Amino acid sequence: DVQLQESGPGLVIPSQSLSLTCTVTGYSITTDYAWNWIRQFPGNRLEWMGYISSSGVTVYNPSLKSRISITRDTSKNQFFLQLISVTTEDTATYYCARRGYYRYDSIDYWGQGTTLTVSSAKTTPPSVYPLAPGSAAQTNSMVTLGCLVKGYFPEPVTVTWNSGSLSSGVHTFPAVLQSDLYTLSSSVTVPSSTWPSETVTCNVAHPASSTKVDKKIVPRD
Amino acid sequence: DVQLQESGPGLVIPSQSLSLTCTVTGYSITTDYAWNWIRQFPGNRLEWMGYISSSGVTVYNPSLKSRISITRDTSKNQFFLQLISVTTEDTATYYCARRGYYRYDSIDYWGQGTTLTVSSAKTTPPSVYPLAPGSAAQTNSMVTLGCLVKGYFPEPVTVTWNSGSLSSGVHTFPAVLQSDLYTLSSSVTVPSSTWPSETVTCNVAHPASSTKVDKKIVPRD
Amino acid sequence: GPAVIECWFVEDASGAKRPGALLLEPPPRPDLDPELYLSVHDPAGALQAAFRRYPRGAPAPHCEMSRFVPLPGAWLMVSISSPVLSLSSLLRPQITMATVVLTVLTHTPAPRVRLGQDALLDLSFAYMPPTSEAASSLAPGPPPFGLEWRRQHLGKGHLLLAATGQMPAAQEGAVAFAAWDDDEPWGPWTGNGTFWLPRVQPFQEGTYLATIHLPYLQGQVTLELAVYKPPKVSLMPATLARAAPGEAPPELLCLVSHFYPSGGLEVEWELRGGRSQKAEGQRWLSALRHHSDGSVSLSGHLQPPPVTTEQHGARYACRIHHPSLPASGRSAEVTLEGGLEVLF
Amino acid sequence: GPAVIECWFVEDASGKGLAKRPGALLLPPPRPDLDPELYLSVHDPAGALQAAFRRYPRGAPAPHCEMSRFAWLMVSISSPVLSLSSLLRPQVLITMATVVLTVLTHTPAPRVRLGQDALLDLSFAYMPPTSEAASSLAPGPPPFGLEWRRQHLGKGHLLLAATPMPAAQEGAVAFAAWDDDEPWGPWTGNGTFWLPRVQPFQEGTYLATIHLPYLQGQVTLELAVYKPPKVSLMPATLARAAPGEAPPELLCLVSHFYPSGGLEVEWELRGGGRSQKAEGQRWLSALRHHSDGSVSLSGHLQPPPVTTEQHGARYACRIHHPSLPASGRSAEVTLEGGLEVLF
Amino acid sequence: QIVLSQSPAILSASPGEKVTMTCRATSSVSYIHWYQQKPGSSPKPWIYATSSLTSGVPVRFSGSGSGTSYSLTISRVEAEDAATYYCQQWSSNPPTFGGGTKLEIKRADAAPTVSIFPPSSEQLTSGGASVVCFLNNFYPKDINVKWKIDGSERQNGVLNSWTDQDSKDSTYSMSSTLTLTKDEYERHNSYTCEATHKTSTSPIVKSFNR
Amino acid sequence: QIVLSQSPAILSASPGEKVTMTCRATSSVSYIHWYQQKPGSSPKPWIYATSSLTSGVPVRFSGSGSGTSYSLTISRVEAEDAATYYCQQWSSNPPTFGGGTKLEIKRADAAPTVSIFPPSSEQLTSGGASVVCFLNNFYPKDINVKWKIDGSERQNGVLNSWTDQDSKDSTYSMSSTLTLTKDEYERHNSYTCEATHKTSTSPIVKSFNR
Ligand SMILES: *[C@@H]1O[C@H](CO)[C@@H](O)[C@H](O)[C@H]1NC(C)=O
Ligand SMILES: *[C@@H]1O[C@H](CO)[C@@H](O)[C@H](O)[C@H]1NC(C)=O
């Protein structure tokens, strides 16, 4: 299956050093296939960074050589990315990926990616608020609900309705910046017969600050 | 003081090999600087071929490495260019040139250039015809004369009037290629009071055919 | 900055020192012989830019020349030391004029890192190759270089990191970064070199020698890494283990926890009400308790006079000054509210 | 070109003659007459061995092909069109193999005219193992060496080489370069050899060697030189004899040709009719060696006295040589005027 | 450094047209590989070796090109193909990518389903009050949302987000959010979320505080 | 392979004007060198190290630039400056040149002086006859030549060429050559050389067959 898993803090202070980690399973990083690091800036501009080559031997982008160091842990099947003296221009989505040793070989396997921003920050957990329609609202045979998420910074947030049981009719909007806090909202549409009775709860997780809360939508008397 | 002079055959049969030589005076090719070969295609597109260094080391354009060879002869203070298995696309004027070993160095000395043609050829010597004013001319205070050089292959053929004595009022027009033959004309302008007196000779030389003919411009009968 | 640098030439094979000048019709000054009075030519630009970026009106930096001998014409090595920068340069002659071949520079020779944080040593370098190198080079370009980092243990050299085809040694989690600024075929080349040390402990402070290995050339710079840590200060009273109240005179203990430099730590006692006033009573300091994380701790003991009614609501305080603290120091206090019956 | 190649797997060691068994190269039909170890399904990622068969001339015969133990297998394919050498690595049943190195020439038997320049052209393709890319910081095509040697009983004679040129003999120049310098994949390159003004002493067998790290590729070329002779006919006589005693005797001069063997002179009398091979005593002179290696030769013929019926006819010597067309060259002198009086 | 340039940048197509984007390199390149990336997920390997499909990619995709010019073709576009495609080479030392080419799907114009929401009880206990407004499933991407409180469109305290494009509906969605202070929230009674679309004129939805 | 690009293909200017030509690189380079090339001559080194003038270059020339954008400036265009200028870098393995920038010089319009010449007596002996017409010293470049054999126009067998310009006159010259065969030349008598310029209309010069 040869999967890859990025692991990072998501937040780093300027002029400090970041350390990312890629854990691969179902394949050993010492047999073949150079293991790379690729980041995507805001605006969707890919940039290759470097790789460790199954037997050590690091090869880097010439523009980053004075700032990049890639290592690997043979015992744990992990390899790492290190960037020194980061700046606001370094915030991006970082991917680790596999690539063969021949010209017809492509970057055949990618990780899920970790968001990483660089700011003065002070990471804050979010505050999840339910969203129910008004008591004097017109009745349609399909009601829509949601839960507002605000008060958090680091970078990413996840929203899952009914722990993934509600997949269709779900709309999760991107976040916006107010001062130093992010804010996004999620939407779910469900038949009117299946509400009051039977749950519909808004599960929200948020790493970095390490929080995961649930919010039940109900009243609005 | 320091000069470069290219030489060699102006015509080469396709699939054969050309060989040019550069002779340099006022400076030895063993002391310093690189000694280069630059060619200019029809269309004024410069292209760097390679160089030989002051130690005999050679560096080539990656697009020509399988087809080029630059040598040198320190006894005659010459370095040579050898292009193997030439084609029609190799037709250009070739320059030898000098450049230092540092990034702020420019190509500070060039040669005069040597025209090189590649085709099935069949060299022919030109036919120089005088161009005299008509019998019913207004003969004002300005007598324009000329000569027509028609019927030659390899492109060159320089043209002078009175062997440099007639320098002003001269217009040497470029040659046009009809079929496999070239043809050009030259124009010279002298006052009407000094053509029936003194001589106005048209000097033509074709180096590839080894001819150097002179044509005295005489009035018609 | 300045266009001229005074200096002295020493003979390493001793068993002296002559004057000399370095010019970065010139100014004559015939107090030097044309053998130590050098007019420098820096086409790489690393030497001229150093004194161009020099602080305006700063004192003159220390300098010394030596006779360098390349080993696996003449050569003059110039070492310049200053609180602004540390520099090593190689010069080749032909006032006698000379050209600069190799230059190693750092603008932070005294980096001060906070305990437990990451230290970042920075240097740069510039190399101007002779024509013999470009003429002999198949596919010319920047030469390969080595970058080693050592820490002097007051009588022993200890290698930490080395930018490398695999013969390095990485100790204490350190990493080295090094890169030319471009891979152009010609001209002088400039490059960056940095040294990252994680979670610095006071056993890693001292002299750091950074060495640049060019194929036939050497460069060396020195850095003085120093560590600091601010103390955590607290103030609490009472005394002894199973002793009755008042058996011993009332005691105030100002405890300082986890500060490294272990020197120049001054403890002071004040009483703030009725305006402020320096505290009265017997006072002394405990003995240092050395920890494992490098830092230390201390206790200051104060026996004050009995608590009068006029000092109700007034508070006792211990103020502290230390190089790891600003001019105001750090303070701790205890207010005489429900705890004045102990000291009275 | 052909879709399958029949070959022979040869063995040595025993010294009792080359032992050989059948074998084929499939660029899968069942082959019973071939053991499964000799039936190879070749995989050519560099595409040199495969392309040489796709560009093979249509209707051309099957080229000779033999594999030998280098389980490294070395394939040697020979034909008047191409000489190929390939190295295969292993990993009904069919043993799978992969082409690692392929060195190939399309001029195995070049024929050059005396005085002209010879151009020996080869090409090569290299498929590296993953262990080479995995250990290359700043990776790319490896540096190689390309040496040129002319073989003859006596000593190995290296003429030119790719710069690691520390050779350069007889004015020869070597040309070699990868097709690109891309970091990955298999690489391809060319290797040409130039010989200026080829003289007869430069004839022989030429061996081209590719010098890759822990790898060796080799092909052989057979350079041959020729020179069409100049033919002429004229009356002539002996020098150190009695005045007027020797018979007329014609002279056929064969001037400046190199391949001394295979040249025969023949006489005719073109006008009964024209078809009439000349009668009389004939012989051949010795070879006149020139400084350029070519030779010359004289033909003689003592014909019978010319009658009044042979008037208008003419004698002629036909020259045949491998460097000549099937009709050969012919020179004739006419029996009219003063020649009828001499003959 | 070889630079790759993708020409169409963005290209629109109805479900059923043949489309083609191009990737032009500055230098010769042996192979160019393509990657399909939808928003929020990593780029998927789409085709390698110029023209070889990666397992799982529909056969309606195809790659072509040589030397310095390449292309990617969809015989008939599909709603599930709405994403950005990147071409990549590794013929020089630093492998590069193209700027991408987004494939926007054309679709019949559809009106949005709007719905407003009052602030939560846990939010008022904190001190703030945010009223949200969802506009779901409309195709014409351009749309204005005006927060009229008894008339005036109140600003300086509002923010809205957008959905890229649905892989099945081929539609868009918006989410306007007006953040207020509690002192200014309970002092008013009207809260209206006005829309603006190319399908009708007016469509409003409101909620009364009382 | 770094590729240089020059902004205008041809820059037209008048004597005394300050004009700027630019050169843009795909990748960053340290220095850019400029060369002046008049036609039929060798490219002369004009500016080295981005801003330094070669020994002999007039002080009215100046260069600037950094990274990937460089420029060449003439503080005062003069007639002898008419040439083609190339920028050159050597930061990669193959040093490349720009496409060139031809500096054409605007000038007051000038009428040409026409001159016709009959075939040479030595030419008729071979078997051919060429009638030559010369158009000398005109600036507006674009010119038309109508050949009138006796009366009708000859639209076949006409070849001509131009000069590139002039370092002193800033004008141009043209040479039309109506070539014929000796058998198809004696059949007609009059031969007129007509010109058409933007100065005046129709200067005609003709010759009468003996
Ligand atoms: C490292 O290189 C960059 C760009 O080449 C430069 O801006 C920076 O000043 C260098 N570092 C130091 C410490 O000079
Ligand atoms: C190598 O030889 C082949 C033979 O046809 C030719 O096509 C190819 O262009 C050559 N390579 C180079 C770099 O010229």
Numbering used by the authors:
A (entry chain H), B (entry chain A): 1 to 221
C (entry chain C): 1 to 15, 19 to 27, 33 to 80, 101 to 122, 132 to 201, 206 to 314, 318 to 388
D (entry chain D): 1 to 27, 34 to 76, 102 to 122, 130 to 202, 208 to 314, 317 to 388
E (entry chain L), F (entry chain B): 1 to 210
From the paper:
Loading of MHC-I molecules with peptide by the catalytic chaperone tapasin in the peptide loading complex plays a critical role in antigen presentation and immune recognition. Tapasin, a key component of the PLC, is a 48 kDa transmembrane glycoprotein that bridges the TAP transporter and MHC-I to facilitate peptide loading. Mechanistic insight has been hampered by the lack of detailed structural information concerning tapasin–MHC-I. We present here crystal structures of human tapasin complexed with the MHC-I molecule HLA-B*44:05, and with each of two anti-tapasin antibodies. Movements of the membrane proximal Ig-like domains of tapasin, HLA-B*44:05, and β2-microglobulin accompany the transition to a peptide-receptive state. Together this ensemble of crystal structures provides insights into a distinct mechanism of tapasin-mediated peptide exchange.
To obtain additional mechanistic insight into the contribution of tapasin structure to function, we solved complexes of tapasin bound to Fab fragments of two well-characterized anti-tapasin monoclonal antibodies, PaSta144 and PaSta220. PaSta1 binds all tapasin molecules, whether free or bound to MHC-I44. Consistent with prior immunoprecipitation data, PaSta1 and PaSta2 clearly bind to distinct sites on tapasin when evaluated with purified proteins by SPR. Both antibodies bind tapasin with KD of 1 to 2 nM. PaSta1 binds tapasin atop the N–IgV domain. This surface remains accessible in the tapasin–ERp57 complex. Although PaSta1 interacts with tapasin largely through the CDR3 of its H chain, PaSta2 predominantly exploits its L chain CDR1 for the interaction. The first loop of interest, residues Glu11-Lys20, is almost completely modeled in the complex with PaSta1 where one of the copies in the asymmetric unit shows continuous electron density. This loop of tapasin is not in direct contact with the PaSta1 Fab. We compare the various models based on superposition of the N–IgV domains to visualize the potential for movement of the IgC domain, which is displaced by as much as 14.7 Å (for tapasin–B:44:05), 8.9 Å (for tapasin–PaSta1) and 10.9 Å (for tapasin–PaSta2).
